[PDB]
Swiss-Prot record, chain A:
The modification N6-(pyridoxal phosphate)lysine is found at residue 196. The gene is serC. Belongs to the class-V pyridoxal-phosphate-dependent aminotransferase family. SerC subfamily. Its main location: cytoplasm. It comes from Alkalihalobacillus alcalophilus. This is Phosphoserine aminotransferase. L-glutamate binds at residue 42.
Amino acid sequence: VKQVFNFNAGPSALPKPALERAQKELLNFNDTQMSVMELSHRSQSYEEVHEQAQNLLRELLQIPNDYQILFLQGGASLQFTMLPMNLLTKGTIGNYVLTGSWSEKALKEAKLLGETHIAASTKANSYQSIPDFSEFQLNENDAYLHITSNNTIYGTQYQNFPEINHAPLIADMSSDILSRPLKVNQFGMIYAGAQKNLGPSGVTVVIVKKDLLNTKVEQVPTMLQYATHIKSDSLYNTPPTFSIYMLRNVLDWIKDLGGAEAIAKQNEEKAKIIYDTIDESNGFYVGHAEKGSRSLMNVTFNLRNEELNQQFLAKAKEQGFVGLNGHRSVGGCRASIYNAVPIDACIALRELMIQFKENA
Amino acid sequence: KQVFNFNAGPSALPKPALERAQKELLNFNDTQMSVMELSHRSQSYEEVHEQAQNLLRELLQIPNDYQILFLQGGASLQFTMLPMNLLTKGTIGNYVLTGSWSEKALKEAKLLGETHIAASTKANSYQSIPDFSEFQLNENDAYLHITSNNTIYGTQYQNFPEINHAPLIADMSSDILSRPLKVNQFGMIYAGAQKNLGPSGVTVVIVKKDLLVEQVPTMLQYATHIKSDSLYNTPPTFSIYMLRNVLDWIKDLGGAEAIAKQNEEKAKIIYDTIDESNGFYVGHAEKGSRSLMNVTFNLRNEELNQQFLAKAKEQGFVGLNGHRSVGGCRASIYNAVPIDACIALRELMIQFKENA
Ligand SMILES: *Cc1c(COP(=O)(O)O)cnc(C)c1O
Ligand SMILES: *Cc1c(COP(=O)(O)O)cnc(C)c1O
Ligand SMILES: [Cl-]
Ligand SMILES: [Cl-]
Ligand SMILES: [Cl-]
Ligand SMILES: [Cl-]
Ligand SMILES: [Mg+2]
Ligand SMILES: [Mg+2]
Ligand SMILES: [Mg+2]
Ligand SMILES: [Mg+2]
């Protein structure tokens, strides 16, 4: 039928082959004559999937052997409280770098549980950039330093990651995990809801340095201890089996296209198509981010006034574009271009943007 | 290629729900996207989300003063979320112990506050539900918690106690919407979907609104999710979609009373087989407490137990091994397990007995 271009911000476009694969075996997985959704998570067919999803992630990001991969429910939002619940002990400080709204939500939850600090923030200038690492105020009693690698709502992104030795570096990578190569040993823990760049909603990937968190924390509910899930290999209680399966399928696709290094090349190219369009528009489109901080995953921009914003977004929706409205808290526009968004969608958006501009 | 799915969790689902999911997996509602590819703030998703709630409300006849929540973390997270929200200082989390899942819930409450055992059939290895006249209740109970169906032990409440000093709270993971319910008896009901309602990944929480908070993490407050209609953060959208589909199937067959008829016939097939076996098969539960959802039994010795389960597996039956904590056999016959599978089990049970 008509064209559909999926720029949804979360959940988001999946790679077609992962969906086609799921569709074909939805009723009979691995010749069991059952859906993967109808299997015991103690079955060997399921355990194979669970282990493969882990091994693909390990290979793709080159995760070291002293790290474990957890598959948890609850979203990144639950990690906002689980992290300080496990690591923010008395006399210690949850130190946060604020580079958008998701960073503030993480901070707020630690505030409920302990001493917090703000190491650096670009909030004053409306989160248009990543602060310089030299501005980071660090504390000897920091439990960790927490960052948001990709600021989904504001369209900014870390180009690289700080070297931190006094505390573990923790990162909310929900909207850019496995969009590029990563030196995992820079971190104590990485977490990501899967629904932005790794597949479906319902599972959260948590990559953790085992010895930072494989020990029982007194007074913490069993389900909320990392130790619980480390010890049980994310099978303490029933996992989100279809979500993990779909995650597996998406990881297979990333591997098939050449891994993190190849997908970064694709992601830089799609992003360039949109940013060049903005940059050649003579101010008709204005990107929110400063150029050195532009995200490769979420492109945020405004037209010159809200009336034009609305007409542009209404025209897009009529032409088949989905999800371009900016986050409700900031307005404007947001083109989410995660791994699986195809480049011809980006070209289509460029065409839209140029004809709208020329015809305005 | 015959397979009979007696898995205990996650479990068999209705074929029409899975076929419907398959057919539109790539193009949901003519959007040309999977339901999995939709924003949870889209109208497209929002209608599915609401439709799932509406079907539960209809099918269980849930009054207006109850809210229906879709949460992540399984029934296991509810074990701690409940006392986190309701077990305030100077109050008591009171538990009725009718199996190991009861025990797991009580354990989490003990982390957070004072607990109490209203009644327990543990001494007799959980062969029955205690007499409600036996309950020991406290003026300062924050709640009375029960497990409606004791998944590992094969026992089930026939009816529920009339409790007015405190909210009655029930872990209905393995029997929710397998029969009609009087929801007004409860302050809260919760269940992982993965037994009777859908795939794993979503937990249904039915809560008396005005019943349920300084210092609890935002995600762990019921009020967060009540206030945001379970859209505070990204919900498990595909699991809720599948839950909708399963609920449409239950509605289509005639609702909670109709599925109870089917379930009672399924259970009747197996229990009759056991009772007519002259002691060859022995059920764990006392008759008066027999579950309609998990039928637990053993052969006369461990070696016959093992021979039977091996024969079963060879013949395409899946999931009949009892829980590791108790051994024996367990036939889980949740809503979507078809009567034909129970008939097949019976026929295997009878043939095995003849050939022993
Ligand atoms: C989407 C997002 C979240 C929220 O994830 P949920 O799974 O909805 O809790 C948190 N952090 C970032 C950076 C996100 O983009
Ligand atoms: C299956 C079950 C649970 C465990 O549910 P999860 O979703 O695995 O946490 C809890 N209580 C009962 C009665 C169950 O049958
Ligand atoms: Cl942000
Ligand atoms: Cl977002
Ligand atoms: Cl039990
Ligand atoms: Cl069980
Ligand atoms: Mg491959
Ligand atoms: Mg194309
Ligand atoms: Mg219908
Ligand atoms: Mg008879």
